[PDB]
């Protein structure tokens, strides 16, 4: 919903093979595509942790009553069957809810990955690039596939195009 309202590109890039999200460059080279591995790994780890959490749930076994005998205690055994059934029903619903919320979380965070990737791109491009607001930046220089690959790797330096750069704090 965020991207839809904000005018983010609603389509996707088949070229993006090595990952889930990343960058595209648009110029005289046509169109280059590079996956960002950091963002992809982050998503994968969240999902993995999410899987672990769902797998940690433990519920009591449902077994026979030790004292209720067939024929002699049929009425009791009918109620016992009812208890088993309602238990299976209730825990099932609770699990479906847990899985539902997990999936809601995963799908929703996509636009947040883009927003984060946009911050990473902004710093690397330097103060000479212009922010359009739709997840795209306008640059003074050409960026072919080779240039994009260094952006995705975080090694891109605007100084190589004789453009100003932001320095990183020594921490």
């Amino acid at each position: 919903f965020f991207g839809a309202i904000a005018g983010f590109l609603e389509g996707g890039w088949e070229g993006m093979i090595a990952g889930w999200h990343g960058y595209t460059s648009h110029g005289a080279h046509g169109v280059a595509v590079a996956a960002d591995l950091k963002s992809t790994q982050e998503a994968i780890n969240k999902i993995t942790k999410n899987l672990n959490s769902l797998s940690e749930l433990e519920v009591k076994n449902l077994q026979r009553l030790s004292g209720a005998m067939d024929e002699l205690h049929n009425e009791i055994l009918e109620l016992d069957e009812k208890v088993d059934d309602l238990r299976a029903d209730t825990i099932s619903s609770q699990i479906e809810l847990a899985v539902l919320l997990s999936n809601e979380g995963i799908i929703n965070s996509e636009d947040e990955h883009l927003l984060a990737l946009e911050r990473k791109l902004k710093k690397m491009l330097g103060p000479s690039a212009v922010d359009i607001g739709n997840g795209c930046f306008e640059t003074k220089h050409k960026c072919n596939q080779t240039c994009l690959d260094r952006i995705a790797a975080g090694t891109f330096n605007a100084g190589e195009f004789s453009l100003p750069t932001f320095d990183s704090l020594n921490i």
Binding site: G11, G12, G22, H26, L54, N61, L100, L101, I107, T139
Partner: protein, 343 residues
């Protein structure tokens, strides 16, 4: 040039449910469920698993063992898990029983629900000295031993009047004391023998129907015997007999005395069952083959991979997957996107 953030596009045949976007297609998923296949039953990993009550006792049924049939007295190992393989346990020897006239068939299934089961080494009642004249302890060729042609159930004593000039008797009462530990339940087995008019006169000095009543833990049961015209012998030792026995049991909690009121033909309790703890019981079949994480009434033994499972829910013990209504999936990709192109 223009540089933008973007998301991949790939085949997205998989569907997951969301709260705010409904069902959506995604590039990849992690399945959370499988549908198990029906396998043989097995031992529960980490837990001794009971099948037959006394596995060393060959050619014995669980009911034979529970009644203390000759040849069927042995060790009954402890177990925290048990398989109920006979919904209607049968006998396979000894004196002919009219089983369905009581709750007796379920006796071995009751025993298997306890963790520890043992047959007492001492008699709970002295049958020879019991009320109603001195008795000789009856025996029968129907109940043989590897070292004898004749015998009887270890749990009971066929009390028949010693004295000539034996006659009819008023209802007599015996107390059945609790002789197990404070931690054990006592399951007391008793019953009565009946026959045709002449044989009744010979054995007991009365050809009329006899009456019997037991009382334990607030439960009373009443029985009246049958003189002749019995249903056909079955599940017994093969020898023709003119009479039949009826057998029952009563459960006595620790420190609780039970009573039996009887006339002629009484089968007084002798060796009793002492039982403590609880065993996890589910329906299944024999034999147990191998190890499994989980025992499941409909699928038998199975090992736990996925956290959940689909199919038929039923009772299940051990390290088991949790039943769910639908084959749930966890998203492991991105929501579907149409491929983007230039012109």
């Amino acid at each position: 040039d223009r540089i933008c953030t973007g998301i991949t596009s790939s085949n997205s045949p998989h569907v997951v449910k969301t709260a705010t976007q409904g069902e959506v297609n995604v590039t990849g998923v992690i399945p959370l469920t499988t549908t198990p296949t029906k396998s043989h039953f097995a031992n529960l990993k980490g837990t001794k698993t009971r099948g037959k009550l006394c596995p060393t006792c060959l050619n014995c049924t669980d009911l034979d063992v529970a009644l203390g049939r000759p040849m069927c007295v042995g060790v009954t190992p402890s177990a925290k898990a048990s398989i109920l393989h006979e919904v209607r346990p049968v006998t396979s020897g000894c004196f002919p029983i009219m089983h369905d006239r009581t709750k007796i068939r379920q006796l071995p299934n009751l025993l298997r629900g306890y963790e520890k089961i043992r047959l007492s080494t001492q008699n709970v009642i002295n049958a020879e000295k019991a009320p109603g004249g001195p008795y000789r302890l009856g025996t029968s060729g129907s109940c043989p031993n590897a070292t004898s042609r004749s015998g009887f159930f270890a749990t009971m004593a066929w009390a028949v009047p010693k004295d000539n000039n034996k006659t009819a008797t008023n209802p007599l009462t015996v107390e059945v004391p609790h002789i197990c530990t404070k931690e054990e339940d006592q399951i007391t087995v008793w019953g009565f023998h009946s026959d045709d008019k002449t044989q009744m006169k010979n054995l007991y000095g009365d050809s009329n129907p006899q009456k019997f009543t037991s009382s334990a833990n607030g439960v009373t049961t009443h029985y009246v015997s049958q003189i002749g015209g019995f249903p056909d012998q079955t599940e017994d030792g093969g020898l023709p007999q003119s009479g039949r026995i009826v057998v029952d049991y009563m459960v006595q909690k620790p420190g609780k005395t039970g009573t039996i009121v009887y006339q002629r033909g009484i089968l007084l309790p002798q060796k009793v069952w002492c039982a403590s703890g609880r065993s996890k019981v589910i329906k299944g079949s024999l034999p147990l083959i191998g190890e499994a994480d989980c025992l499941h009434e409909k699928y038998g033994g199975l090992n736990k991979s996925k956290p959940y499972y689909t199919g038929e829910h039923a009772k299940a013990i051990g390290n088991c997957p949790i039943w769910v209504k639908t084959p749930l999936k966890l998203a492991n990709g991105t929501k579907y996107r149409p491929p983007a192109k230039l012109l």
